[PDB]
Write a protein that binds this ligand. Structure first.
Ligand code: HEM
Ligand SMILES: O=C1C(O)=CC(=O)c2c(O)cc(O)cc21
Ligand SMILES: O=C1C(O)=CC(=O)c2c(O)cc(O)cc21
Length: 403
């Protein structure tokens, strides 16, 4: 019985700033190589496994045999020189503890929960768009709207005072500053970890609808510890700005394809489905994020993952799975059920998914029908994207309209 292979060599995945929303050439390679591959990233050390197919990604992210808690142990190979989550944040918690932590704020993030901030956010967005309309056609449709809106929405939902929004943005970008943008990221994490400790403890020891009040209440009832509450609050706060990057890519795409743009401009009722397809397609991040450690031996597509080995999943790769999404690279606003995974999978799935969709829907409504014929001020290829980041997106989005 011939001796075959299951030894894909370790392939280096250097830090590379990609153009616009173009797919990562290296990930394409890894995908076709096989369902299970091995990678080496800029920071940390080792060669972690990489899963890329839709079904296997769901398996790894939803199976108790793969944990996050142990990732803190050794120094797994990764993109960021530092680890983003705190030593007790949900990102580094497994089911037992992870479950009661997510349960503490779950009601604030369901479709029903986030719809409660819908109208409030709409007014907030109109104020930003109106201010832009007042300034003048030449505008940066990121600094004017895409950045300020998501920041205001997450701050209002978290219970962060408007006067502190600038601090949140400063710290978040230093932490997600592609991390290799220094490492000054650790001090920024600590400062943010101190801010939320104060907020949760200070004032949030009463009754409010905001998330920090909810967390403070849970801490007071001894349901979760401080630190657990702070760790979760910080990840929610930084994650809230993910909509800036993503919607930036969303509008760059739309403004690059007149066919797609007019259809959304003419058919408002198809916008929710269309936005979900865009979310599937847009390559949200550079490379991969946070791995999981095999807690025991597990076989994936004929490959034995040894206990202790690190394993990454690529949600971007899974969203381009030919088997699940026929003609993966094509943007089809109709799309069958299309269960992408841009918001992750398993216990760690994004708590902000519904909120992100709500924000994107409001942004599209305002940008397409509030601003008279908005359009890119330069060629799609001339739009500058962030070069040295974790979450991909425009550094600036030059636009004009018709006023
Ligand atoms: C279109 C915008 C967004 C995208 C594409 C996105 C995507 C993701 C992905 C891929 C993960 C990884 C799941 C894993 O660990 O395997 C994640 C986690 C997370 N996201 Fe988002 N996200 C978005 C917006 C948000 C927003 C607005 C918030 C704040 C409400 C948020 C909060 C979080 C948190 C707290 C986690 C960690 C969950 C955990 O480990 O339990 N996300 N997100
Ligand atoms: O763990 C990941 C991860 O592995 C990939 C991500 O994109 C991500 C993210 O966008 C936000 C997060 O809170 C966590 C992650
Ligand atoms: O981009 C990353 C990333 O590269 C690793 C992360 O762990 C992470 C995270 O825990 C939360 C985030 O919002 C983003 C990230």
């Amino acid at each position: 019985e011939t001796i075959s292979q299951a030894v894909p060599p370790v392939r280096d995945w250097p830090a590379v700033d990609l153009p616009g929303s173009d797919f990562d050439p290296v990930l394409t390679e890894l995908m076709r190589e096989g369902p299970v591959t091995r990678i080496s990233l800029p920071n940390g050390e080792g060669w972690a496994w990489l899963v890329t197919r839709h079904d296997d990604v769901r398996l790894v992210t939803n199976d108790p045999r793969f944990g996050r808690e142990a990732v803190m142990d050794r120094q797994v190979t990764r993109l960021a020189p530092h680890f983003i989550p705190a030593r007790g944040a949900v990102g580094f918690l497994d089911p037992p503890d992870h479950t009661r932590l997510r349960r503490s704020v779950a009601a604030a993030f369901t479709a029903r929960g986030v719809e409660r901030v819908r109208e409030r956010s709409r007014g907030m967005l109109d104020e930003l768009v109106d201010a832009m309309l007042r300034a003048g056609p030449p505008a940066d449709l990121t600094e004017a709207v895409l950045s300020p809106f998501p920041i205001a929405v997450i701050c209002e939902l978290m219970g962060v005072p408007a006067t502190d929004r600038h601090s949140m943005h400063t710290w978040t970008q230093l932490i997600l500053s592609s991390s290799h943008g220094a490492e000054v990221s650790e001090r920024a994490k600590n400062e943010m970890n101190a801010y939320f400790s104060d907020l949760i403890g200070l004032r949030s020891d009463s009754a409010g609808e905001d998330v920090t009040s909810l967390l403070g209440a849970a801490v007071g009832r001894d349901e979760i510890t401080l630190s657990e509450a702070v760790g979760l609050a910080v990840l929610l706060q930084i994650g809230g700005e993910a909509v800036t990057n993503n919607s930036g890519q969303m509008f760059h795409l739309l403004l690059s394809r007149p066919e797609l743009a007019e259809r959304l401009r003419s058919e408002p009722e198809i916008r929710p489905r269309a936005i979900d397809e865009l979310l599937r397609w847009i390559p949200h991040r550079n490379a991969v994020g946070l791995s999981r450690i095999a807690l025991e031996d597990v076989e994936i597509k004929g490959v034995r993952i040894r206990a202790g080995d690190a394993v990454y999943v690529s949600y971007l790769a899974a969203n381009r799975d030919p088997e699940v999404f026929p003609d993966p690279d094509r943007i089809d606003f109709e799309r069958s059920p299309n269960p992408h995974v841009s918001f992750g999978f398993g216990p760690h799935y994004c708590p902000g998914g519904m909120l992100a969709r709500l924000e994107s829907e409001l942004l599209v409504d305002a940008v397409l029908d509030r601003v008279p014929g908005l359009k890119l001020a330069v060629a799609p290829e001339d739009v500058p994207f962030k070069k040295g980041a974790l979450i991909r997106g425009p550094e600036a989005l030059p636009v004009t309209w018709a006023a």
